[PDB]
Design an enzyme around this catalytic site. Structure first.
Site, PDB file in Angstrom:
ATOM      1  CG  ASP A  68      -1.498  -3.732  -1.699  1.00 23.47           C
ATOM      2  OD1 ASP A  68      -1.876  -3.671  -2.508  1.00 23.47           O
ATOM      3  OD2 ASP A  68      -3.106  -3.944  -0.579  1.00 23.47           O
ATOM      4  NE  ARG A 126      -2.672  -5.796   2.676  1.00 22.34           N
ATOM      5  CZ  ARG A 126      -1.926  -4.364   2.628  1.00 22.34           C
ATOM      6  NH1 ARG A 126      -0.543  -4.446   4.228  1.00 22.34           N
ATOM      7  NH2 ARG A 126      -1.617  -3.354   2.624  1.00 22.34           N
ATOM      8  CG  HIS A 147       1.142   4.810  -5.267  1.00 26.63           C
ATOM      9  ND1 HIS A 147       2.272   4.912  -4.365  1.00 26.63           N
ATOM     10  CD2 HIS A 147       0.401   3.942  -4.327  1.00 26.63           C
ATOM     11  CE1 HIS A 147       2.675   3.969  -3.623  1.00 26.63           C
ATOM     12  NE2 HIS A 147       0.892   2.969  -3.651  1.00 26.63           N
ATOM     13  CG  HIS A 192      -6.697  12.604   9.230  1.00 25.44           C
ATOM     14  ND1 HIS A 192      -7.902  12.670  10.109  1.00 25.44           N
ATOM     15  CD2 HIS A 192      -7.640  11.375   9.279  1.00 25.44           C
ATOM     16  CE1 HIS A 192      -9.046  12.588   9.722  1.00 25.44           C
ATOM     17  NE2 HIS A 192      -9.094  11.158   9.502  1.00 25.44           N
ATOM     18  CG  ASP A 227      -7.441   6.943  -5.605  1.00 20.82           C
ATOM     19  OD1 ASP A 227      -8.410   7.308  -5.431  1.00 20.82           O
ATOM     20  OD2 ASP A 227      -7.186   8.108  -5.168  1.00 20.82           O
TER      21      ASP A 227
HETATM   22  C1  LIG Z   1      -4.598  -2.288   5.535  1.00 17.66           C
HETATM   23  C2  LIG Z   1      -3.776  -2.235   6.199  1.00 17.66           C
HETATM   24  O1  LIG Z   1      -3.052  -1.920   7.044  1.00 17.66           O
HETATM   25  N1  LIG Z   1      -3.407  -0.579   5.211  1.00 17.66           N
HETATM   26  C3  LIG Z   1      -4.331  -0.485   4.217  1.00 17.66           C
HETATM   27  C4  LIG Z   1      -5.208   0.036   3.823  1.00 17.66           C
HETATM   28  O2  LIG Z   1      -6.252  -0.550   3.013  1.00 17.66           O
HETATM   29  C5  LIG Z   1      -6.265   0.324   1.554  1.00 17.66           C
HETATM   30  C6  LIG Z   1      -4.603   1.392   2.114  1.00 17.66           C
HETATM   31  O3  LIG Z   1      -5.018   1.549   3.449  1.00 17.66           O
HETATM   32  C7  LIG Z   1      -3.836   1.060   2.220  1.00 17.66           C
HETATM   33  O4  LIG Z   1      -3.807   2.386   2.305  1.00 17.66           O
HETATM   34  C8  LIG Z   1      -2.888   0.148   3.602  1.00 17.66           C
HETATM   35  O5  LIG Z   1      -2.552  -0.294   2.292  1.00 17.66           O
HETATM   36  C9  LIG Z   1      -0.585   0.133   2.203  1.00 17.66           C
HETATM   37  C10 LIG Z   1       0.131  -0.756   0.631  1.00 17.66           C
HETATM   38  C11 LIG Z   1       0.009  -0.346   3.471  1.00 17.66           C
HETATM   39  O6  LIG Z   1      -0.682  -0.840   4.666  1.00 17.66           O
HETATM   40  N2  LIG Z   1       1.440   0.939   4.181  1.00 17.66           N
HETATM   41  C12 LIG Z   1       1.771   1.050   5.199  1.00 17.66           C
HETATM   42  C13 LIG Z   1       2.749   0.240   5.335  1.00 17.66           C
HETATM   43  C14 LIG Z   1       2.010   2.496   4.282  1.00 17.66           C
HETATM   44  N3  LIG Z   1       1.826   3.588   5.133  1.00 17.66           N
HETATM   45  O7  LIG Z   1       3.489   2.614   4.568  1.00 17.66           O
HETATM   46  C1  LIG Z   2       0.689   4.956  -1.344  1.00 13.65           C
HETATM   47  C2  LIG Z   2      -0.316   3.902  -0.709  1.00 13.65           C
HETATM   48  O1  LIG Z   2       0.307   3.439  -0.115  1.00 13.65           O
HETATM   49  N1  LIG Z   2      -1.800   3.419  -1.839  1.00 13.65           N
HETATM   50  C3  LIG Z   2      -1.987   2.272  -1.458  1.00 13.65           C
HETATM   51  C4  LIG Z   2      -1.621   0.881  -2.707  1.00 13.65           C
HETATM   52  O2  LIG Z   2      -0.118   0.638  -2.351  1.00 13.65           O
HETATM   53  C5  LIG Z   2      -2.519  -0.298  -2.585  1.00 13.65           C
HETATM   54  O3  LIG Z   2      -2.640  -0.602  -3.293  1.00 13.65           O
HETATM   55  C6  LIG Z   2      -4.083   0.203  -2.491  1.00 13.65           C
HETATM   56  C7  LIG Z   2      -4.698  -0.949  -2.754  1.00 13.65           C
HETATM   57  O4  LIG Z   2      -4.534  -1.391  -0.461  1.00 13.65           O
HETATM   58  O5  LIG Z   2      -4.853   1.482  -1.390  1.00 13.65           O
HETATM   59  C8  LIG Z   2      -3.694   2.235  -1.410  1.00 13.65           C
HETATM   60  O6  LIG Z   2      -4.052   2.911  -0.652  1.00 13.65           O
END
Ligand SMILES: CC(=O)N[C@H]1[C@@H]2OC[C@@H](O2)[C@@H](O)[C@@H]1O[C@H](C)C(=O)N[C@@H](C)C(N)=O
Ligand SMILES: CC(=O)N[C@@H]1[C@@H](O)[C@H](O)[C@@H](CO)O[C@H]1O
Length: 335
Positions: A65, A73, A165, A177, A247
């Site tokens: 991502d 990342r 998305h 949640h 997803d």
């Molecule tokens: C690695 C991490 O911190 N988070 C991962 C984790 O892996 C898949 C799922 O959750 C994904 O939704 C998320 O990545 C997304 C891209 C994420 O970081 N979003 C954050 C910045 C948000 N809520 O705005």
């Molecule tokens: C809404 C949102 O953030 N969805 C994320 C997506 O952006 C990301 O590419 C994917 C893989 O990490 O995981 C999902 O949960």
């Protein structure tokens, strides 16, 4: 009845492959691996991780991502990329969007990865905490214009594009949640707004990823599990022909009954080509077990997501590299 096609994208715990990592990667139903911050130290080490994986599976899709802004990342040793929202706030937004897409995609492939899950086609309605500065715009048409320029940039760099998305995360809350979030609007309201970027760009996107969002006036299921969304609307009405990722089938807060085995089946039956099981190895193995029982074979179209760049230390001597840097430094979008 289809004897189905499908594939699994999974992840690993650390910065190099354990013995269990190597054994699970050997299975052909496993088609992809996505990396996260816990897998990433320095660029030389991501390149070695990718080479390690290709020594095992030369055909694997390797993803990350790498959007810019608050979702990036690959940080240390990389250009810090702007949020999509900051790009829009310039007179020359279209050219800067194209420059950003090109720079992100060449740096990502320079460390051995095929693709970034980008760009975000969601709309900033000031409503979803998971969108915010990750969207280009709130106006549908200008978001589609700037994201289309971003995608042209990724393509010239050799990288396939994954919009997300579908059909739009902008109007629904940020996956609490307590419940799966909902976007309660009529299909014609959605078609008139959040669906527009996907409609414009369906012909240019190589892949799409759904939102974990229920739109009850259209289907009682989250979009990533709905044949009405993915088949009737996306492939039918919007004639999208690319790859569909699911997803995160093992996300925290999923609110889907059934283990990862029934979820990947559901994702595949709805029309997904590859199921994502993130941050949960025990579930990844259950979904792999399930794909084995169904004797799935890989979707034909999956190899179109492989990057056309290569792992190198060279690109910074490419002519275009310095124009992107100059143009983006002028807009105060990078340093
Ligand atoms: C690695 C991490 O911190 N988070 C991962 C984790 O892996 C898949 C799922 O959750 C994904 O939704 C998320 O990545 C997304 C891209 C994420 O970081 N979003 C954050 C910045 C948000 N809520 O705005
Ligand atoms: C809404 C949102 O953030 N969805 C994320 C997506 O952006 C990301 O590419 C994917 C893989 O990490 O995981 C999902 O949960």
């Amino acid at each position: 009845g289809s004897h189905m096609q499908g594939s699994l994208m999974l992840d690993i715990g650390g910065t190099w492959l354990t013995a269990e990592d190597r054994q699970i990667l050997r299975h052909p139903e496993v088609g992809g691996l996505i990396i996260f911050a816990r897998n990433i130290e320095h660029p030389a080490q991501v390149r070695e991780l990718c080479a390690a994986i290709r020594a095992i599976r030369p055909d694997l899709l390797l993803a990350v991502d790498q959007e810019g802004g608050r979702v990036q990342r690959l940080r240390q040793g990389f250009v810090r990329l702007p949020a999509m929202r900051a790009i829009a706030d310039n007179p020359n937004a279209e050219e800067l969007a194209e420059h950003c897409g090109w720079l992100m995609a060449t740096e990502v492939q320079a460390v051995g990865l095929d693709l970034s899950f980008a760009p975000v086609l969601d709309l900033d309605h000031q409503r979803s905490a998971v969108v915010g500065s990750r969207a280009f715009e709130g106006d549908p048409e200008r978001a589609a214009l700037l994201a289309g320029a971003f995608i042209r940039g990724m393509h010239a760099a050799g990288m396939a594009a994954t919009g997300k998305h579908f059909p739009g995360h902008g109007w629904a809350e940020a996956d609490s949640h307590v419940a799966i979030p909902e976007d309660a609007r009529s299909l014609e309201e959605i078609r008139r707004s959040d669906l527009v970027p996907f409609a414009r760009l369906a012909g240019q996107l190589d892949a799409l990823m759904p939102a974990h969002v229920i739109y009850p006036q259209v289907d009682p299921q989250p979009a990533g599990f709905s044949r009405r969304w993915l088949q009737e609307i996306l492939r039918g009405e919007l004639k999208f022909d690319g790859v569909i990722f699911s997803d995160d089938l093992s996300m925290a807060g999923a609110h889907v009954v059934g283990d990862a085995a029934s979820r990947i089946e559901a994702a595949l039956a709805a029309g997904c080509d590859m199921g994502l099981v993130c941050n949960d190895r025990a579930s990844a193995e259950l979904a792999l077990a399930a794909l084995q029982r169904l004797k799935v074979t890989p979707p034909s179209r999956l190899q179109r997501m492989r990057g056309k760049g290569y792992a190198n230390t060279d690109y910074r001597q490419q002519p275009r590299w310095l124009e992107a840097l100059s143009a983006l430094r002028a807009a105060q979008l990078i340093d």
